[PDB]
């Protein structure tokens, strides 16, 4: 099966757009692909973190991924810092990465401007660690955010350069583009996607958000002033109403035409009530599952320990090959 | 006992100046200090290495240190790459090192942007790995040559920055103060210290050099034109004669004044022949011992295995405290 590597920032925060758009689809693909989910705590610390929050959020992310349906027997899920081979490969790959490839990175320049008080070497060097993360597992495909395209291209270039020097040691990874999930946009500006760091909290619904707040947000979602009220799909002219239909469709699996038939003669209030009920229901169930996992420390420890063992057993094969190629005396 | 950490490049090429200065003093102090010797193969690959030669030179280095008297039951001797904790701590310390600090450690202020863009990231980032190597062992003292002073100052600055944020996790390391004494000087320029990198090989005697070559280079050593020719120690006016007396004294243990009396009435040719006999004898013996270790593959493995296990046991205590302070979920 193709090997898919996804890195998750330790946050606990996932928008519904993220879930229904992507993660929820990936959860259904665990039999057809060899999926590896890595909670990237080593990357988080390129910005200063509160130590208690970092630990807490690591566990929050794990419990959330488990609640969403990532199955630790079918997939490999682990915390990055629990697998030494990441940091080991990252150092080695530094030596096959050009300083210029790192200095020209858009993200480095952008984050340098925003974190001007903490331009540390980790902020500069983290694309190398990202490359290590991916290349360690003989990864075929990586789901890439728009802002991560340049980082994926560096991974491919490093892998290619290393293979040209030493033989086929790494796989050249490709973008993971699975079939479209649900379309979900911001509730007060439906021309833009949801973003977890939006200053307008009424735009965004997160998976662990109090259902009562989620319902309020949906009930005040932007709709048009058409007279009479017409529940019909048209992104250009009726973006707000269209987005409510797309969100409901994403929850129930009903088609846009089916929903338009179902809502013939109805008010925008009725459409919003329907969306609020469907989303609240889905989120309340997910949150009960999250709580069951999140409160079970022994289960979380077992999953992390087992995940890290699974990951290390794959990673060590690749690192041994890298170290062999470079010329190091193998550990006895 | 204070903890002393020394990093050794995988070379096999040490001069008699290294041996009679640094290494031999360090051998005889394995009882007063808790000494750690790290063959720094991860640092070596910041410059391109022929793989077979790197592996060979790593073993050469180990066998040479054993031949010289480094005792793996009194001291901890190991290969850097065998201890994952070095790379793990290095990534973490990247995040507490300023890009500005590494930039000022390079030649960039003197050099073009093309030059800077074309170096590998390992060459830029190695001062952090060096900091990690030292700090991982609660090191009190580090033997630093003049060219490594900036590097030790950065280590101290990182350690203090980290401790200021998180508590007293690291010892602040200090320079190791070597025994006051004469340095072995170059044979054709006795006003200059004997150096590995000298392009005039007649200046240098290496520990593993053919004893015929050693004898030739000593018999041709530069001496003064005093008339009458007097075998007396005076570094200012008789640098070459003085250097020969220093080298002989280093081999036989005889004080300089004992040697001045011994050579009363003798010609410089006599002194040179005596120095050559004594050094040739010493290196011949050293080389016999070196071959004994170097051809014993099972012993080298045993030494590497035990050394890495001793190092890892210590490194893991410190890495665990660093991770705990940062806020990572502890290794499950
Ligand atoms: Ca004198």
UniProtKB/Swiss-Prot annotation, chains A, B:
Keyword Cytoplasm (UniProt): yes
GO MF entry, a single one: tryptophan-tRNA ligase activity
Short sequence motif named 'HIGH' region, residue ranges: 10-18
CDD domains in alphabetical order: TrpRS_core
A Gene Ontology biological process term: tryptophanyl-tRNA aminoacylation
Subcellular localization: Cytoplasm
UniProt-annotated binding residues for L-tryptophan: 133
Annotated motif 'KMSKS' region, positions: 193-197
E.C. numbers: 6.1.1.2
Cytoplasm as UniProt keyword: yes
Catalyzed reactions per annotation: tRNA(Trp) + L-tryptophan + ATP = L-tryptophyl-tRNA(Trp) + AMP + diphosphate + H(+)
GO cellular component terms listed in the entry, alphabetical order: cytosol
Gene3D superfamilies: HUPs, Tyrosyl-Transfer RNA Synthetase
InterPro entries: aa-tRNA-synth_I_CS, aa-tRNA-synth_Ic, Rossmann-like_a/b/a_fold, Trp-tRNA-ligase, Trp-tRNA-ligase_bac-type, Trp-tRNA_synthetase
Broad class of where this protein is predominantly found: cytoplasm
Binding site for ATP: 9-11, 17-18, 145-147, 184, 193-197
Keyword terms: Aminoacyl-tRNA synthetase, ATP-binding, Cytoplasm, Ligase, Nucleotide-binding, Protein biosynthesis
Enzyme class: ligase
Function: Catalyzes the attachment of tryptophan to tRNA(Trp).
Assembly notes: Homodimer.
Family recorded in the similarity comment: Belongs to the class-I aminoacyl-tRNA synthetase family.
Cross-referenced PANTHER family: TRYPTOPHAN--TRNA LIGASE, MITOCHONDRIAL (PTHR43766:SF1)
Protein name: Tryptophan--tRNA ligase
Organism: Yersinia pestis
